[PDB]
Amino acid sequence: RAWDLIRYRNFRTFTGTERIQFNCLAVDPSGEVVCAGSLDNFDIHVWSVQTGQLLDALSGHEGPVSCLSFSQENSVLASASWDKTIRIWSIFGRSQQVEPIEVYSDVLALSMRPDGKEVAVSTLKGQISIFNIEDAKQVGNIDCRKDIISGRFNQDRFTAKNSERSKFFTTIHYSFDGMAIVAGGNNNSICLYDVPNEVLLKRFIVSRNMALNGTLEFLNSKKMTEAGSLDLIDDAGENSDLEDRIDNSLPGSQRGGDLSTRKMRPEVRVTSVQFSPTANAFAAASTEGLLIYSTNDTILFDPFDLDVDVTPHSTVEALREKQFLNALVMAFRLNEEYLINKVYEAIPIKEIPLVASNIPAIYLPRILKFIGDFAIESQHIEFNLIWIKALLSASGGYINEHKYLFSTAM
Amino acid sequence: SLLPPTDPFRRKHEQLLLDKLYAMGVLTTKSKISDLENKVTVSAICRRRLPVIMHRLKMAETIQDAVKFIEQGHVRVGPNLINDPAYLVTRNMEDYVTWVDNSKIKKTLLRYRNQIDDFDFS
Amino acid sequence: MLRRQARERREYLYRKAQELQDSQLQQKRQIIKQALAQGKPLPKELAEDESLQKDFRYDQSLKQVDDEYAATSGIMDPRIIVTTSRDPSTRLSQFAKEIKLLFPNAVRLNRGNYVMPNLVDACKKSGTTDLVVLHEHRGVPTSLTISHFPHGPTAQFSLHNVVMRHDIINAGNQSEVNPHLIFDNFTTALGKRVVCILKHLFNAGPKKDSERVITFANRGDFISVRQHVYVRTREGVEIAEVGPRFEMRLFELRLGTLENKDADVEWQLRRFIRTANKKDYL
Amino acid sequence: LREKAKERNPDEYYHAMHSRKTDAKGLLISSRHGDEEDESLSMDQVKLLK
Amino acid sequence: AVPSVQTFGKKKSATAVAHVKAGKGLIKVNGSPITLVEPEILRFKVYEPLLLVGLDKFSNIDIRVRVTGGGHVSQVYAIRQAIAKGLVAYHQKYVDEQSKNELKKAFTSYDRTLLIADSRRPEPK
Amino acid sequence: YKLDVLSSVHFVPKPASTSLEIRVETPTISMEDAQPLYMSNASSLAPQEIYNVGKAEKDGEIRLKNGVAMSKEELTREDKNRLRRALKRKRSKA
RNA sequence: GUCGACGUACUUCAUAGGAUCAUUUCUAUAGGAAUCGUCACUCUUUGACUCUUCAAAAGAGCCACUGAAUCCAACUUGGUUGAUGAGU
RNA sequence: UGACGGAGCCAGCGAGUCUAACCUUGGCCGAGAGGUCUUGGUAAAAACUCCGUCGGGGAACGAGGAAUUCCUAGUAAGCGCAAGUCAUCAGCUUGCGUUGAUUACGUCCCUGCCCUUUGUACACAC
RNA sequence: CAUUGGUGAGCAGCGAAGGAUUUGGUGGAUUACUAGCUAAUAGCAAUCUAUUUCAAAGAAUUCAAACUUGGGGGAAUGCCUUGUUGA
């Protein structure tokens, strides 16, 4: 179903042709073509938005489609399926030609670069294989099966080091820069890799909540006894109230329906992961909600290009004798948020354009990041808008060239 | 049944409910419409349960061993594996029930037929 | 997808076997629907019979395309591939081409080293509805098999009195518009079956104006096919022929596809029977 | 036999696969002397026999 | 027992089974040393999974192959696929995963079909 | 519903639907959900849905779809012909 | 090419007689055979528990301290004046 | 655009107590049918790599004109092996493998071939 | 020639007043440490009873009451609800 978000309406509902169960969605940049693929039919349906009819049923997988995406630059549809393949379909413009790629095993999520040249693909054996689309060739994979924290369930009879319930990443997403991949899965950990160096940056644990099942690594032997486990008895009898005794649960109903339409405790899992298109954050939808993880330069001491003569005392001195360009660049070299704010408001409105012209190329992205972070919640709208006009005005074309380092900042 | 025969609501609802239950697999044929009250049994629902399907597909030897191998954790339906002997498997997931990867039971099949390939770590 | 296709083969064959077991129960249910309506006594069997009478409410609620085609008769236009035998000859390559033009939505395909299981597989997996493979004898074509793919029938025809448009007359070139179809003198149940295969090989629901009809005349066990273009003059119709003329003839009708070679055989022509020549459709 | 080979189901597991072996050429090797222990001898039995 | 790993390679209609067991460093193919794999032009097609990763990794294991089916060139491509899959699979089993990664990066950056099957499955256009 | 929950949803859907339903002009702030802010403002009907242009309620005029109206008198005779032709083919289909 | 009438040719239907069992006594008949506060002993049938086979599969996981078993090293004793093996 | 030797080297389909010639010269035995032997005449993996060697045809011909047809990846083209399946096929037909490319993969300009000229479906835009 | 199949007899090499498999039992950890019992603002812990009873306070649904049942036909007698005769 398509939804407006100004007048709040289904303006269309594309339907099937025999009503199958749709399980992934992908839609063009110039939002006129919607593809969806199901786990039922292994044919990617393609509807056209305006005339709500279906243009095509692009077929050719042998095994259900697990993801789809659109390269938003070159506009190609790369899709991937439990086939153990990727197919890059080129749908517009007399071609209708298609190019397959064999991956080692059973792919189950996909992610296109911002740029449109690369596809990262998260498979069932536990790699992220990063391919190049103009060629068909694998420009790097990263092996992951190890740095993943699968816990033991109370209803398990096999060790967590063997439990292959969750040794893979079912969701993936590049950065908006082209440098990181966040991946998350059916387990207790979100892992954040760097794409060039192939080596991971942090592993985040979604929860520590022993009222979820996949969350402890090693259970307790005080619990398991001759009867069986001990968290697994029924205690609804103990409850003092009829609606707390009543236990509807249709037997073996693995993840559908209400929460007590199954007699099993929830499992920690990350259902889906994304980065933030504006700030430094990412967000991951999981069992207990959407975990939103973010950043503070105002806490970490991450200087840039330092030297001996660059102190907060020295930059304040550079203000008080008015070499405003130098005071600003010393602020950006020391990289301390209060300091940058301090000089930012010291320098005066006549002198703003010359400074904005003479800033260095290396520190341009940082000054843009700072203006964004101050700007959404500050009040000096003339100060900020004068700054932004001068910055774009004097360094527009450079930004235009380096379109991708500045995606989030702009 | 107590509604009258020439009645398209009745005809629509029974044709639709038969096609529902047959897709689930609890009744085998979709022609005779008396099968709702005649051949819909707790035993039919049980024999769509998970261990029985392994046993029918010959992934086991007997339903006790299918149950045992499920419980020890060798069986998966698609990507995600089942510890749950009481899982009810619709026809289209009967296509996808399979062994897990790198289990010792998978290796035994392959090593017998003499097709282990350790690049797969099968 | 391999395990899927195989599973529905197994199912549909089963559910057909059931059907041939309950035709007799069909018949025992029709009797009661006559006798309730117009008051007539029932036989001793249905009289004493109580399973039936106890569940004759439900079955009272109960109540043409062929069955393999019924799933997608009018919804989707077909996709056909027309392909030559192996190392063809120049005349056969022409014949394959103009057959491709005879059917709308047909894509020619050259076989060199495409072994048959790989051809059936690749068509199945890509999704082409049916496949036409053609056999020569020094330039003259002599056979044609047509087979429908989600595990459905293959008709083999042998084809005989051939003349080709490209080699007879260059008066012009074919319309390539959705044609009209004429199916003459197909009567027996097998005849209905052959109508169904050829008819669903054709295209979408063609317009009322299309000036290209294609005739399939069953004259005495021999199917004859011609293409025609026409006009409507004020006194009558002026028919100008186009396309190849060849007498087709059916001689086998298997149920699998064309690789199988042990699928069941619905009808096979039998030459050395004592009364072979006497009948039709035998 | 050809139809059975066509519905083989290549995931079947029977338990006697641990005793029975095969070739490199595919078809299975059956011993001529009967049992799982009836293949070959030991040094004490062979010494006593000598 | 012995540390031993079996892999398979495959081009048009050839096949090639590699057993890799830890030993002293020999390489044989159908019961002859590798330095006489026959078509003699493509001997370096066979030597390149050795000389892309240096000889020492083969100084400490005993790789022994058998092929069949196909013709000259097909048996060449099956041998080298089987050897490359053999060396990287043994390294994952009986040494470290890091050296599995470095091996597979070498063979994949040079030629991915050392490791994956080059199946020219048809296309109806 | 019970049979979907039992089967752990992997079913086959309904056949189809198409059923008419009525919506009201209403402001978008009065449509959304209760919390101190708001997000959207424009009215829930579109301008074209509160006044399309259709055929004029006199007879003396012909009114086209692009919002231009012309009296029957002030057309030259050829133009009266050509507009009759246009309505001829349009209502000839519909 | 179709239904009416006639002609012929097939298909399908009754169950009587006698008994026993069914009511927590009695199935309707006197033509029929059974009301007892236990003690041992034999042979037989199913089941638990412990081990195990076809024939495997999974370990509520770790350190410590303490017993026990088996095989080799070693030493001690008996042993070509005959050790172990071995169907009266 | 190769001959002639040796030497290395690799396939995939085929497995019904059924699979397959014609004349001839004479000997022996038998009553004959024929049997046995003798004698002559006519019919029925390759490529590839390696090593040495060589350097017009018995009158028509030295790779085929104008014209037209066909062709987009295990594709064009080479190379052999096997079967013979109720129609067709031996003046041959279908399978099976083996080495395996050059050139487009764009455009409606040409020759054609269809199509719509009523947004109508529901936002936003156009 | 292989064996990537057993069962053994032997070396090189490793090698400090020995080594190698298997198994019972107890202790500590497995969630992030504020001490024991009782009639509890306190006493006890060698003991709660020969003050352990008093006084006060404390009594709706005048009966809401199986939210608790596999499906289909029923119910002699039960049960139940509504009417009714005689006290």
Swiss-Prot record, chain C:
Cite the Brix domain residue spans from the record: 78-259
For this record, the Gene Ontology CC terms, alphabetical, are: 90S preribosome; Mpp10 complex; nucleolus; nucleoplasm; small-subunit processome
Q: InterPro entries annotated for this entry?
A: Brix, IMP4/RPF1
Natural source organism:
Saccharomyces cerevisiae (strain ATCC 204508 / S288c) (Baker's yeast)
This protein's UniProt keywords? Nucleus, Ribonucleoprotein, Ribosome biogenesis, rRNA processing
- Subunit notes for this chain? Component of a heterotrimeric complex containing IMP3, IMP4 and MPP10. Interacts with MPP10. Component of the ribosomal small subunit (SSU) processome composed of at least 40 protein subunits and snoRNA U3.
Q: Does the keyword Methyltransferase apply?
A: no
Mutating R212A leads to what result?
A: Loss of RNA binding
**Name this protein carries in UniProt:** U3 small nucleolar ribonucleoprotein protein IMP4
Query: Which GO terms of the molecular function aspect are on file?
Result: RNA folding chaperone; rRNA primary transcript binding; single-stranded telomeric DNA binding; snoRNA binding
Tell me the Gene Ontology biological-process terms attached to this UniProt entry: maturation of SSU-rRNA; ribosomal small subunit biogenesis; rRNA processing
Swiss-Prot record, chain D:
Compartments (UniProt record): Nucleus, Nucleolus
Q: Which superkingdom, per the lineage?
A: Eukaryota
In which family does this protein belong, per the annotation?
Answer: Belongs to the UTP11 family.
* Subunit text: Component of the ribosomal small subunit (SSU) processome composed of at least 40 protein subunits and snoRNA U3. Interacts with snoRNA U3. Interacts with EBP2, FAF1, MPP10, RPS16A and RRP14.
Job description of the protein: Involved in nucleolar processing of pre-18S ribosomal RNA.
Q: What name does this protein carry?
A: U3 small nucleolar RNA-associated protein 11
Q: Which organism is it from?
A: Saccharomyces cerevisiae (strain ATCC 204508 / S288c)
Q: Which gene encodes it?
A: UTP11
* Residues of the whole record sequence present: 51 to 100 of 250
UniProtKB/Swiss-Prot annotation, chain E:
Name the major location: cytoplasm
Q: Which GO terms describe its cellular component?
A: 90S preribosome; cytosol; cytosolic small ribosomal subunit
The protein's UniProt keywords, in alphabetical order, are: Acetylation, Cytoplasm, Isopeptide bond, Phosphoprotein, Ribonucleoprotein, Ribosomal protein, Ubl conjugation
The cross-link Glycyl lysine isopeptide (Lys-Gly) (interchain with G-Cter in ubiquitin) sits at K28, K45, K57
Pfam families named in the record: Ribosomal_S9
- In terms of domain of life, where is this protein from? Eukaryota
> At which residues is Phosphoserine found?
S32, S59, S74
A GO molecular-function descriptor? RNA binding
Gene Ontology biological-process annotations: maturation of SSU-rRNA from tricistronic rRNA transcript (SSU-rRNA, 5.8S rRNA, LSU-rRNA); translational initiation
**What subcellular locations does the record give?**
Cytoplasm
**Residues with the Phosphothreonine modification:** T68
Anything else of interest in the record?
Present with 33800 molecules/cell in log phase SD medium.
Per the record, the similarity remark reads: Belongs to the universal ribosomal protein uS9 family.
Annotated function: Component of the ribosome, a large ribonucleoprotein complex responsible for the synthesis of proteins in the cell. The small ribosomal subunit (SSU) binds messenger RNAs (mRNAs) and translates the encoded message by selecting cognate aminoacyl-transfer RNA (tRNA) molecules. The large subunit (LSU) contains the ribosomal catalytic site termed the peptidyl transferase center (PTC), which catalyzes the formation of peptide bonds, thereby polymerizing the amino acids delivered by tRNAs into a polypeptide chain.
UniProt name for this protein: Small ribosomal subunit protein uS9A
Q: Which organism is it from?
A: Saccharomyces cerevisiae (strain ATCC 204508 / S288c) (Baker's yeast)
From Swiss-Prot, chain F:
Q: Where in the cell is it found?
A: Nucleus, Nucleolus
Question: Can you tell which superkingdom this protein's organism belongs to?
Answer: Eukaryota
The UniProt family comment states: Belongs to the MPP10 family.
- Quaternary data: Component of a heterotrimeric complex containing IMP3, IMP4 and MPP10. Interacts with snoRNA U3. Component of the ribosomal small subunit (SSU) processome composed of at least 40 protein subunits and snoRNA U3. Interacts with the SSU processome subunits EMG1, IMP3, IMP4, KRR1, NOC4/UTP19, NOP1, RPS4A, RPS4B, RPS6A, RPS6B, RPS7A, RPS7B, RPS9A, RPS9B, RPS14A, RPS14B, UTP1-UTP18, UTP20-UTP22 and UTP25.
Query: Its biological function?
Result: Involved in nucleolar processing of pre-18S ribosomal RNA. Required for the early cleavages at sites A0, A1 and A2 during 18S ribosomal pre-RNA processing.
Write down what this protein is called.
Answer: U3 small nucleolar RNA-associated protein MPP10
Read off the lineage from the record. Answer: Eukaryota, Fungi, Dikarya, Ascomycota, Saccharomycotina
Report which part of the complete sequence is shown. 446 to 539 of 593
